[PDB]
Swiss-Prot record, chain G:
Outcome after substituting residue 23 to S: In HPRI; Los-Angeles
Included range, full protein: 26 to 53 of 110
Residue ranges the record marks as coiled coil: none
Highest taxon of the lineage: Eukaryota
Organism of this sequence: Homo sapiens (Human)
Name of the featured protein: Insulin B chain
Curated annotation (Swiss-Prot), chain J:
Protein name as it appears in the record: Insulin B chain
Outcome, altering residue 9 to D: In HPRI; Providence
Gene (UniProt): INS
């Protein structure tokens, strides 16, 4: 479950950093 | 991304690899 | 700027809904 | 797309599931 | 409104913090 | 409602505390 | 506490999933 | 029970639906 | 504005990630 | 990395509680 | 110290108010 | 100024780094 929570923050971070380029997420 | 950044704090440059 | 904020909630929603399938996002 | 559809009107979980 | 939906998301987080042990109800 | 009051003007924690329980 | 943090995500999740039905939350 | 059920193991959307109303 | 309030929430989250060890100050 | 995650929730909480006074994080 | 104080045990609203 | 600058137009990470 700790991984699931971290994933939520990870996806938020990618959204900010990647900007116009966008990003991809998979487990 | 899960393997690298959920065991240790990833930096902005490190995370940018998954963009 | 409202589009930028909505995008943040959008990726969080996609993260929960898409699960194992993962997803792609590009503003 | 998703931004046009879900930021102009409230999208449901099922609606959002299409972009997975 | 889409803005209302976004605001609601922040509201429930706020209630979660403020209400503590009492818990809460939310309905749009 | 909470949405009517707090999505039109900024509600404080004390204001929000009314909707607990 | 990890439980307090988990609760925050759970409430966000309930908000999206329950939609118009709304939901209830209490940390017991 | 949601904290006990969903904070020890990952709950699915359907599982979470039990706490709607 | 309520919209300013919501945006601020995202701003503080962003500063937390970007500023890292340096930390930051916030005042509305 | 749990502390880093906790920090994210901490700043969100400080933002709501402190209101007009604002706050500091380091 | 907030990380030391509030990430090991749940801090209350009053406790958090110290960091305002 | 951060609210004025970043809530009226989208601020980047680099732009935001100024308020650190
Ligand atoms: Cl928002
Ligand atoms: Cl968390
Ligand atoms: Zn979290
Ligand atoms: Zn928001």
């Amino acid at each position: 479950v700790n991984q699931h929570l971290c994933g939520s923050h990870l996806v938020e971070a990618l959204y900010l950093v990647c900007g116009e380029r966008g990003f991809f997420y998979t487990x | 991304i899960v393997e690298q950044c959920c065991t240790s704090i990833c930096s902005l440059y490190q995370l940018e690899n998954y963009c």
